[PDB]
């Protein structure tokens, strides 16, 4: 018969080799980490368990965590129990059911698919919502609600399952790789079957624009959340400068220098009226968040105006009367709304925090399939090599599963006090 590139795809056995127990340890590590990251929740969020007084608001981003953290729990349950089936009997899977002989990697490569791409527009879609939180408040109350965050997760598993069925038709059917534990989508063909190497260009490309768009969209939410630390930054400078003013005034001696420390004060106050919170613009300037601080900036033009009056005469107990009353009324009208924003502010860097060191690892461990998947129906294939470049391949797909383990393991890490107190505090 002809010898195919695979070289060890018919194998019943699993190919004789070393590094079996490695595999078991890394699924209880990941295990281990899955189930932490859910207890942590649990006691820490979202937990439905029991009546807890606080219970947060549940927020898309929290809830879309919770569906990706379950999907891969489900992936990992699903998928586990037959790679250590295969190594402990030492059975290949395309032999070691007699009723399922072809379909018990088939179902396998299925669910691999699957739960690849469910993970790739869950994070797509934690992306999108990092993304229109900061710069389109009002688009994200008008569709992103909180049913949204359970919503997402069957829409997810209906399209990747609606697309996955291609393979079950004709198009680019599974094969088994080297080891013996793993089966996934088939992507050298020497057989240039347009057919088959649809499917996989296919899903190559999908991955790429969608890890693309993810990156697009974590660098505008990067972007949004500058500009809105900018923007608080300067909030802040303006009020340091009116504090500044308000002390040189209770202190200065010659009417010249009160003259100028009330311009210099009115025009800090001119330019910071004009300002906008971070999520503050879904709602027209009429509600009583921004109502009230408009009408105490408004006040506080008004008493500057009223100090520079008073300068004018020459008189400098009223003025410092007047710096003082300023000193008194801008306190209740501008700290509670800056410490609101300091807050959302640091809500969304966490987040964004979150979502970045996500999808950095879910790049790095998606490039190189899709580079290996490109490296197979365009580039040549003529029998360049049967170990060196099944290594590479092994390589990569144990780069594409160890995605879970990773997930899980990194998430826990911003469940401690002293990363957040150290990235919250870089960004105060």
């Given at each position: ?6 070289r060890c ?5 699993v190919?004789k080799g ?8 890394l699924?209880s590590?990941g295990?281990?980490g ?5 207890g ?21 981003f929290?809830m879309l ?16 129990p ?9 059975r ?25 791409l469910?993970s790739?527009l ?6 999108l919502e ?24 069957p ?13 079950f ?6 094969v088994?790789?080297?080891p013996?534990?793993?089966?996934f989508?088939?992507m050298v063909?020497?057989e240039?079957?347009?057919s ?46 009116l ?7 209770e202190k200065?001696?010659?009417?010249a ?10 025009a800090?106050?001119l ?7 971070p ?6 300037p009429?509600?009583?968040?921004m109502?009230?601080?408009?009408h105490?900036?408004d006040?506080l033009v ?5 100090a520079?009056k008073?300068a004018?005469?020459g008189?400098?107990?009223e003025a ?16 509670k ?9 640091l809500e ?12 950095v ?25 049967r ?14 599963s ?9 998430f826990i890490?911003?469940?401690s ?8 505090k870089i960004?105060i």
């Open positions: 018969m002809k010898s195919p590139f695979y795809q018919n194998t019943t056995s190919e070393n590094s079996a127990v490695m595999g078991g340890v699924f590590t295990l281990l899955n189930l932490l990251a859910l942590l929740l649990a006691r820490s969020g979202l937990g439905w368990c029991s009546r807890r007084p606080l219970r947060p608001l549940p927020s898309v929290y965590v919770c569906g990706l953290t379950v999907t891969d729990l489900l992936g990992k349950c699903l998928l586990s037959v790679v250590l089936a295969a190594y402990a009997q030492n290949s899977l395309r032999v070691l059911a007699p009723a399922l002989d072809n379909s018990l990697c088939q179902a396998f490569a299925f669910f691999m698919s699957f739960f690849g469910s790739t869950q994070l797509l879609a934690m992306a990092c993304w229109l939180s900061l710069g389109h408040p009002f688009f994200y109350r008008r569709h992103i609600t909180l049913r949204l965050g359970a919503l997402v997760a829409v997810v598993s209906a399209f990747s399952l609606a697309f996955c069925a291609l393979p038709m004709g198009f680019g059917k599974f088994q790789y080297c013996g534990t793993w089966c989508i088939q063909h020497e240039g079957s347009l088959v190497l649809g499917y996989s260009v296919l899903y190559s490309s999908l991955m790429a624009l969608l890890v693309l768009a993810t990156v697009l969209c974590n660098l505008g939410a990067m972007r949004n959340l500058y500009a809105a630390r900018r923007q608080l930054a300067d909030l802040e400078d303006n009020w340091e400068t504090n500044d003013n308000l002390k040189v005034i200065a001696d010659n009417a220098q009160v003259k100028d420390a009330l311009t210099k004060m009115r800090a106050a330019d910071a009226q004009k300002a906008t919170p999520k503050l613009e879904d709602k027209s009429d509600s009583p968040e109502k009230d601080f408009r105490g900036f006040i008004g008493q500057i105006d009223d520079l008073l004018n005469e008189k400098v107990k410092q009367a007047a710096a003082e009353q300023l000193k008194t009324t801008r306190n209740a009208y501008i700290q709304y800056l410490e609101r924003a300091r807050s959302t502010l969304e860097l966490d987040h964004l925090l979150l979502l970045a060191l996500m999808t690892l879910f790049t790095m461990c998606s490039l190189p399939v899709i580079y290996r998947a490109y490296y197979g129906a365009f580039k040549d294939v003529k029998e360049k090599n170990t060196s470049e099944e290594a590479e391949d092994l390589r990569a797909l144990r780069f594409l160890v995605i879970s383990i990773v997930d899980p393991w990194i890490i911003f469940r006090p002293v990363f957040r107190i150290f990235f919250h960004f």
